Write a protein that binds this DNA or RNA. Structure first.
Ligand SMILES: Nc1ncnc2c1ncn2[C@@H]1O[C@H](COP(=O)(O)OP(=O)(O)OP(=O)(O)O)[C@@H](O)[C@H]1O
Ligand SMILES: [Mg+2]
Ligand SMILES: [Mg+2]
Length: 373
DNA sequence: AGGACCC
DNA sequence: TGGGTCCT
């Protein structure tokens, strides 16, 4: 149970794909999916015309005045298609980890070993790659790690084919020996293509990044820290004193991220299974006057009740989240949480009242059910 | 409850 | 600055 073969599957412009399937007439039009004042994503036609992920509508339309916009505030259809993709990949191999609605990791190691035991000491020399090899690296058919990663690429090509044939969806895949690398390599050829990373090109991929922030695992706060410390490139992080890093970020963060900077990442692909929470949100200018807007809270409620029904399991906890007024101090939302009574688990209106009291304990309103059982 | 990370 | 995860 040593060396792994992991695939990362990463769909193209996922919300825009879902909307193009729904309304074919948007098919070869540049398309942006809007949420409030943002174009959260857009199809590849629009990316050619300058439209970028998460651009304001204004910038978006004065870069491209012919841009078609559809509202993507209601996530229902995205969410449903997102689970269809996960279940299809689960069928290839059951340990599938979701990351957001349109990325999945699959640990292919058992699958690859089983396919390999199937082949003769004849056809092992006909093993070929499917799709791109990162950095155009030469394959060595006598290297058992090259052979396993190639079989990995063939399984990823089957997955992408099946997603297209069964669900109508295109996507990228990256095959590598761990989740970090699979995730960095999946993005090298886009849209709708795949890439496999052989071990000798690992430093090349890692040093191809232009800032430590691009490392999956290193976010906004951590990047700001490393900066303050004079750490900008992936090589700065590789060569920095482990000790000062430790005595500044904590042992956990320091040792994990410095391993990341080498391309090293032991984290297991984790079975996501069914979701741990269910929530819906609503943004607005500053429209929750702090009074008559429980009305919002009932709408949110009605949808969530229909969803959390549908699941089979039921939530034992409810939470209310808010965002307070005026100026924008970069970190700060607030939440009141209490258990749901069992009278009420097993007829909207008692739920309506719990929510209102937690409101009374305390631009954004959301309800979240959790602690599913 | 809130932080930090992800898409 | 419309969702989700897991750690502190
Ligand atoms: N910050 C965000 N706010 C709202 N929705 C988001 C946000 N980040 C991502 N999404 C949504 O999640 C989906 C997947 O995100 P992702 O970063 O993979 O981009 P994508 O739209 O699939 O484009 P690409 O082809 O580059 O992968 C999108 O279609 C959108
Ligand atoms: Mg992605
Ligand atoms: Mg994507």
């Amino acid at each position: 149970a040593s060396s792994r073969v992991i695939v990362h599957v990463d769909l193209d412009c996922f919300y825009a794909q879902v909307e193009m399937i729904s309304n074919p007439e948007l098919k070869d039009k540049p398309l942006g999916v809007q949420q409030k004042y943002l174009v959260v994503t857009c199809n590849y036609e629009a990316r050619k015309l300058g439209v970028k992920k998460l651009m304001n509508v204004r910038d978006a339309k004065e870069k491209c005045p012919q841009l078609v916009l559809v509202n993507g505030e209601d996530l229902t259809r995205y969410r449903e298609m997102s689970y269809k993709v996960t279940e299809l990949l689960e069928e290839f191999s059951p340990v599938v980890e979701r990351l957001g609605f349109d990325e999945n990791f699959v640990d292919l190691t058992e699958m690859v070993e089983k396919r390999l035991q199937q082949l003769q000491s004849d056809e092992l020399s006909a093993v070929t790659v499917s799709g791109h090899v990162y950095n155009n690296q030469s394959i060595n058919l006598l290297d058992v790690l090259h052979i396993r990663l190639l079989v990995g690429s063939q399984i990823a090509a089957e997955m992408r084919e099946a997603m297209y044939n069964q669900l109508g969806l295109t996507g990228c895949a990256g095959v590598a020996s761990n989740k970090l690398l699979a995730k960095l390599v999946s993005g090298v050829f886009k849209p709708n293509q795949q890439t496999v990373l052989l071990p000798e090109s690992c430093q090349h991929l890692i040093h191809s990044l232009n800032h430590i922030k691009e490392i999956p695992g290193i976010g906004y706060k951590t990047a700001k820290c490393l900066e303050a410390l004079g750490i900008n490139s992936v090589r700065d992080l590789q060569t920095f004193s482990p000790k000062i890093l430790e005595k500044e970020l904590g042992i956990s963060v320091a040792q994990r991220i410095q391993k990341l900077s080498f391309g090293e990442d032991n984290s297991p692909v984790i079975l996501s299974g069914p979701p741990q929470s269910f929530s819906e949100e609503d943004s607005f200018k500053k429209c929750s006057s702090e009074v008559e807007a429980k009305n919002k809270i009932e709408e949110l409620l009605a949808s969530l009740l229909n969803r959390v029904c549908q699941d089979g399991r039921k939530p034992h906890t409810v939470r209310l989240i808010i965002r307070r007024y005026s100026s924008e101090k970069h970190y700060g939302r607030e939440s009141r949480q209490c258990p749901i009574p069992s009278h009420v688990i097993q007829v909207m209106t008692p739920m309506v009242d719990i929510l209102m009291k937690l409101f009374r304990n305390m631009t954004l309103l959301s309800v979240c059910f959790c602690n599913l059982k």
